[PDB]
């Protein structure tokens, strides 16, 4: 900056996770299963989570075998907190598995006050002619999780994971999913 | 009988053309005072105001023709006895800004004739009043404020009995209007400049007269706590160092009666006056006849080892200044039966095989 | 930063929206209909809006069928507020439709103090040989809106949407618009 | 940032404009006529302005007909003001004309504390075979101005416009200018 | 006079009107080309008049009696003919001219070309009524658009 | 550069020539009264006084060219609704004598166009103002007193 680059593309919002309400001050985290569309908060912290249903998410949930790059944009709001009093940071971690033994594939570290953005990507690639069935016992294939940590949940209000397929993306096969409930984005007045 | 009026040839968008009689569009009357000085505006008006109150064959065609592909020829029929002489310079510039300088230096760039009435009976020259295209019009030059300026660069060496007049005859010839466009290519085949290197006065007498003109031309010419600027001279100072075949055009400004022989040479500033071996250097001798008034020195690439700087700091002395100068040295002595100095005007016409190196941050000042 | 990239092009200012005056402190928002050139503030908040008439806007308003990329530059001023006391953030949202059901096509999130810039783009593309009639019932075509949110309207004074056609842009057909009033930019002394 | 891009080229400083001295606190502005090299401050505010004489400026002042891109770098100093007490912002505006009716060709908005930089460019292009005589009545050609606004002149000390020709640049024709005075940059001890 | 700085619409009250194609041409700053007008009779055949059309600049006053020094085109209409196409080639224009001009520029200082329409003789007829005549710029051939208009906001010049 | 001025093409004795734009040398404005009668002088002036106060392309060429081998074309662009009509007659005569008759009979001889505006949109005709030679000049016709006369031979049938 101060002059920006140029964002261009259509990224659809998949998964929001609002942070637990007052007086909960302790450090906390959440995990977005990027492929299977699930949001498991760590411990017994009452995060307020929603999974929306844009076409990207419906494909990622129903498609069995997947291949190629998906671009993510993690947005962070944002409580109305005086800039000089801000001490909140956000550590994120891409992971293959959610087991203790597995390592991170990427770490990011953000301490921008109020709000932040974080574009990254990663290639789903797998054994079966370049395709990956997420979490299949076959070949011990695994997903991609996105562990995210709010060091100060009083100041960080919510995470938000937007996604987009690169044009190289390819799926095959169907999974029988249950009926998806109609959760809608409550836009801010 | 009736005819279809829509299909007549009344939308004739031809340029003005024919003989020199049928393309003449104005005559202008310049008054040269009996006792005029150097740096003295004789005429200074807009080029469109020339044609006001005129009734020649192409006057109405000139005003009303939307496009003119031909150049403007101007000829000046002024004369005086060989006994005397002066130097007039007519010059066309694409515009103005308030309270402008009319020093010869400022003006000459772009399009100009310089002549000595003493030697040349008349003098003509063509030009294009739109310098970046093949065409122009009367309405273009009225609103663009193209400015014609006649200036006397050297006074009368011997004054005439009465006042004089110079008749200018503005015509339209049928040459193609070719554009002169400066651009930032480092190597160029011909970079025109028309940079006034300076007027050289040599007094009558016996002494060693030596005149240095620096070839670090960039960053204008001097004034009070100020400096003057052409465009082409400001353009060459875009680059830091440069080189090329330099094409000077040295002109007589005094009368034929004041006689002198002048050696020109490239050399460096350290050489003092009363150093008697200037003809060890390669040089060019310039004697003028009665009738000849104009002579072109060229200095090839073998006169310069490396490129030299376009600008130099003003406070560098001649002792420590490693750019070349152009010396002009009196080979014998300035003589004549009548009193008056031997004036001589040098004008860097252009640089051939120009090679511009680097990128000048700039200096701010003029002379070296 | 600190050394910038290089902005280059001619972007003409289309739509300004000044934020409601004191003592109004609550969170508020505004929506710029980017194509049809309209500014509807949310609820009954008295925002002070103007639509200017550069050639881009006049084309976007009169052209029926449109195709290709338009680059936006959203500028945010900017009240004279001490930097350490700044808590104001700006969430923006591209949307196709303004209905609750529709999702966002892009979200940005800015918390730069005083002032900010945000360059992005988006391709208008439509059914009729790549052309889109904005808001036509035919094929249920839709516009592009730009919902923008000021979390602190005391600190955010105004939004400003500048636009520019990419050279690929193409229109066809005319719409009979009413007389456009001559609103002019009141430049800041 | 934090790692920068890479500045490279020779930009020569053309026009400085120091801001009016104390106790003048009100919002103020200045206009740099980028081509003709003139600095008209708005109203009767005693700004302390200088136009320097590098080769770029001398060409821009003397050349009649011009064509092609010029890159600008607007630098902003910079009073010694505690970073948390900084509330000063800088709005700039490229304009063709300085009349109320004309619109901006570009707006930038900067609120970086202490100091700032802003690289942009713009192409001079005109009717006469791609050449533009600045401010000629012929074809109603116009200049380029650079209106700049200091919201807090106590904190913003001075503007500074550096410029550079792109290699595509081309001039023709001469203008008879008056003698340029020798103003020199007073470098800071 | 009808100005050829066509861009930025036509006037109204404190307002202006817009076509798309006229808004489109104002995308560019300067432009040029062969202009193809289509002048049409709107009165009856009984109201007769002869009309010269020419390109020229605004400074020329009314009661300047030498319009036929300029290149021009005469337009008489028969009883049956109603439509006639003036074309103005590239030789009528030196350079490109601006698509929009500031509204407050007077005719004295306005360096874009106009299209003059001058009565060659006099408007006549046995029946009362004005000689109406409608000019319509059909299109620009060999169009060349230069630059990038920031815009102006207004209409007439 | 200098050139020999004696050998330039400044003694160009060409006739006036080119398109109809570049050979136009005057326009004249005749007033036809709402209620005009037959045998009614509309215009009557010397053919050289036509060119006084004129500024067309060939005006100065016309006055200054010593010899002109071309004819003079005059065209008259007057019209009126088919409903009405009259008969104008423009006519050129080599001279005059005091208190002259301007009856159509007298005039028409020599060189004349007659037309009805009601039918003919415009009417043109060429002529030679020196009737006994191949050439003429502006100075010839000024001093010879060549006389142009427009007359209305029949009034407006409907005004």
Distance between the termini of chain B: 80 Å
Number of extended strands of chain B:
23
Topology, number of strands of chain A: 12
Rg from Cα of chain A: 17 Å
Summarize the helix and strand pattern of chain A as letters. Answer: EEEEHEEEEEEEE
Distance between the termini of chain A: 29 Å
Percent of residues in β-strands of chain A: 35-45%
Query: CATH first level of chain A: which class?
Result: Mainly Beta
How many DSSP H or I helices of chain A? 1
- Globular, elongated, flat, extended or rod-shaped: what is the shape of chain B? globular
Whole-number total of structural domains of chain B: 1
What is the molecular shape of chain A? globular
Instruction: Supply the CATH class of chain B.
Output: Mainly Beta
The CATH topology name of chain B reads Jelly Rolls
CATH architecture of chain A: Sandwich
Q: What multimeric state do the chains show?
A: part of a larger assembly
Name the helicity range of chain B.
Answer: under 10%
Protein name (chain E): Large capsid protein
Subunit structure (chain E): Interacts with the mature small capsid protein. Homomultimer; assembles as pentons. Interacts with the movement protein (via C-terminus).
Organism (chain E): Cowpea mosaic virus (strain SB)
Subcellular location (chain E): Virion
Descriptive overview:
It is classed as virus. The entry lists the keywords virus, cpmv, comoviridae, picornavirales. Electron cryo-microscopy of Cowpea Mosaic Virus containing RNA-1 (CPMVb). Chains A, C, D are RNA2 polyprotein. The organism of A, C, D is Cowpea mosaic virus. The structure is cut from a larger assembly and holds three copies of chain A (189 residues) and three copies of chain B. Chain A is mostly beta strands and 189 residues long. Chain A has one domain (1-189): Jelly Rolls (Sandwich), CATH 2.60.120.20. In chain A, 4% of the residues lie in helices and 42% in strands. Chain A has one helix spanning 55-62; strands spanning 12-18, 28-33, 38-41, 48-51, 63-77, 90-95, 104-110, 116-124, 132-133, 145-150, 158-165, 170-174. In chain A, the strands form two sheets. In chain A, strands 1, 4, 5, 8, 9, 11 and 12 form a seven-stranded antiparallel β-sheet that branches. In chain A, strands 3-2-10-6-7 form a five-stranded antiparallel β-sheet, with no helix packed on it. The longest helix of chain A is centred in the N-terminal third of the chain and has 8 residues, at 55-62. Chain A is globular and about 55 Å long. With 368 residues, chain B is mainly β. Chain B has a single domain, classed as Jelly Rolls. Helix content of chain B is 6%, strand content 38%. Chain B is built from four helices and 23 strands. Chain B has helices at residues 59-64, 104-108, 138-143, 231-236; strands at 26-32, 40-46, 70-76, 87-93, 95-96, 111-115, 123-127, 147-154, 164-176, 182-183, 187-202, 210-214, 221-222, 226-228, 241-248, 250-252, 262-268, 284-286, 294-295, 298-299, 308-309, 324-330, 342-357. In chain B, strands 11, 15, 16, 19, 20, 21 and 23 form a seven-stranded antiparallel β-sheet that branches. Chain B has a four-stranded antiparallel β-sheet with strand order 1-9-3-7, with no helix packed on it. In chain B, strands 2-8-4-6 form a four-stranded antiparallel β-sheet. In chain B, a hairpin with a 3-residue loop joins strand 13 (221-222) and strand 14 (226-228). The N and C termini of chain B lie far apart (80 Å). Classes of the chains: A mainly beta (189), B mainly beta (368). Chains in contact: A-C, A-D, B-D, B-E, B-F, C-D, C-E, D-E, E-F.
